[PDB]
Structure 1
Amino acid sequence: PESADLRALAKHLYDSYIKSFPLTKAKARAILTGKTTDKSPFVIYDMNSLMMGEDKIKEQSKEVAIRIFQGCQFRSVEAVQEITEYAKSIPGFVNLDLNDQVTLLKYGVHEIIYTMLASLMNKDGVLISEGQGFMTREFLKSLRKPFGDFMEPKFEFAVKFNALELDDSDLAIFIAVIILSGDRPGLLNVKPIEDIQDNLLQALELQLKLNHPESSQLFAKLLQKMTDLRQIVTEHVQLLQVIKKTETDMSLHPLLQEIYKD
């Protein structure tokens, strides 16, 4: 009854997630485990392989570490746009005050970016360029000191998050819960957001009980991952300020400028 409506909501979110995000976790894991008929991704594991694959997985004369860092930022821009399209499919979201929709995305998108990045990661590297490339974790760690630790916190989160074995159906609801967070700074009307989130949280709990019946306390673990993601984003913002106060001539995409403006 209420339960049936919660399954219909879960399915609606899954279907909209499929519409919004071209590279799902299911498709990504198939590439990572080599169980797909598609062409294998080009592996970037050192400076030589970067040179060989850079143009295919995409001139300028920036140092390698800066080209990699800024490429990651451009992927983030595309992710923000996909997440925005997904948010608009969450029932109730587009009827919220428009300034509150902006606030929810501004303070939520990076948490979602990290969540979905885990889908593209294993302990050894990350899929890039819509799955056409694979950049190793060791190569990213080898970059000059300001940039050599930029991805490592994301890998650390991802290995632990991926141990929970969530699928795309689980992730669709988890992401929606995060977007509909009523405690973001400057929200004008918190109650309608909390009401939507309460229903999404009920849908998530039922999804996890049905889809992960042997995974004790998985719901509580995911609530804790939401808290962890906020701390991860905070640390990332700190690293960016460092990168800004030590590096020079670093163009930042205007969409990221809006999101990072504090």
Structure 2
Amino acid sequence: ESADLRALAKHLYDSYIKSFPLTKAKARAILTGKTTDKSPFVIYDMNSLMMGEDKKEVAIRIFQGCQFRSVEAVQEITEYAKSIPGFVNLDLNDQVTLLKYGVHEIIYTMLASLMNKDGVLISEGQGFMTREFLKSLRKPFGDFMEPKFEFAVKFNALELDDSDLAIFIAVIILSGDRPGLLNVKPIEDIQDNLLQALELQLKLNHPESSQLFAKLLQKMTDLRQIVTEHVQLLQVIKKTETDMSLHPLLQEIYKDLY
């Protein structure tokens, strides 16, 4: 059945490339040292932030940035989702349910690709905001990304590439344990096919990294935690920033995440 699980991985890797413009391979090239052609502008203080304003207050504008991009992220993830075999064939309501709870877990997973212990790529790689600058922002804004860094650091630790992430992302989506799913069996039969394909994929692409499959699935707790904490932070600004205004798409996702 290998031929089937390998062909499946092959298909997901393909859709993943067609759905996500900024892959890990590209982010790493910019973060390592291809440079010259891909060299990023860095923001580490209010000074450079201003000089880099060519690519409300500061914290609010940076936040406004994230939301717009997440919205964009949701769009891509939705597109990738309809490519996972069996997904569009499931009950419409559950498709929506899988997306509402899968989106943030996937966003921070892929966001790890653009991070390193020191910062994160922004504006499609055009820029790079240091971890410290972000942390100096007035709270609760300065407390938004730190947990993501902690996660990204431990997660990138696995040294996964895009083809692995392709399947892993698929697995996060087809989670039968989401709140409200009407039909759980059908969703789980798909995941069993994905988890299977992931394990094989991880054993073939990383023949030296022992129990990578088991180590990867264990990162789910970190994702869930980061997501919950995020949802909390959103509440604070929801009360302290009554003129914030959230995108409707994000408003629907945050509906019951608290």
Q: TM-score, normalised by structure 1?
A: 0.95
Give, in whole Å, the separation in 1 of the partners of 2:19 and 2:137: 33
Q: How many angstroms does 1:37 deviate by?
A: 5.5
> Larger deviation: 76-85 or 223-232?
223-232
What secondary structure does 1:148 align onto? helix
For the aligned residue pairs, the C-alpha RMSD in angstroms reads 1.5
Q: How many angstroms does 1:74 deviate by?
A: 1.0
What secondary structure does 1:208 align onto? helix
Residues 122-149 of structure 1 show CA distances to partners (whole Å, capped at 9, x for unaligned) of 1111011111111111110110121111
Identical counterparts, % of pairs: 100
Cα distance change of structure 1 residues 24 and 37 upon mapping to structure 2, 3 Å threshold: farther
Give, in whole Å, the separation in 1 of the partners of 2:229 and 2:218: 17
Residues 214-248 of structure 1 show CA distances to partners (whole Å, capped at 9, x for unaligned) of 11221111111122211110111111111212223
Q: How many angstroms does 1:69 deviate by?
A: 1.2
What secondary structure does 1:134 align onto? strand
Q: Are the equivalent residues in 1 in contact too, given 2:102–2:172 (CA < 8 A)?
A: yes
Q: How many angstroms does 1:150 deviate by?
A: 0.6
> Larger deviation: 110-119 or 216-225?
216-225
**Number of equivalences:** 256
Q: How many angstroms does 1:73 deviate by?
A: 1.2
Give, in whole Å, the separation in 1 of the partners of 2:181 and 2:225: 20
Give, in whole Å, the separation in 1 of the partners of 2:163 and 2:47: 39
Q: How many angstroms does 1:36 deviate by?
A: 4.9
Residues 8-66 of structure 1 show CA distances to partners (whole Å, capped at 9, x for unaligned) of 000100000000000100000000002256331111111111112123xxxxx901011
Give, in whole Å, the separation in 2 of the partners of 1:30 and 1:68: 25
> Larger deviation: 117-126 or 42-51?
42-51
What secondary structure does 2:201 align onto? helix
Q: Are the equivalent residues in 1 in contact too, given 2:30–2:39 (CA < 8 A)?
A: yes
Give, in whole Å, the separation in 1 of the partners of 2:154 and 2:90: 34
1:6 is matched with 5
Task: Find runs of 4+ consecutive structure 1 residues off by over 4 angstroms.
Answer: none
Question: Are 2:254 and 1:260 aligned?
Answer: yes
Q: Are the equivalent residues in 1 in contact too, given 2:30–2:38 (CA < 8 A)?
A: no
Residues 149-201 of structure 1 show CA distances to partners (whole Å, capped at 9, x for unaligned) of 11100011001100100000100000000000001111111111000000000
Question: Are 2:155 and 1:161 aligned?
Answer: yes
> Larger deviation: 247-256 or 109-118?
247-256
Give, in whole Å, the separation in 2 of the partners of 1:206 and 1:259: 33
| Structure 1 alignment gaps of length 5 or more | 56-60
Q: Are the equivalent residues in 1 in contact too, given 2:164–2:201 (CA < 8 A)?
A: yes
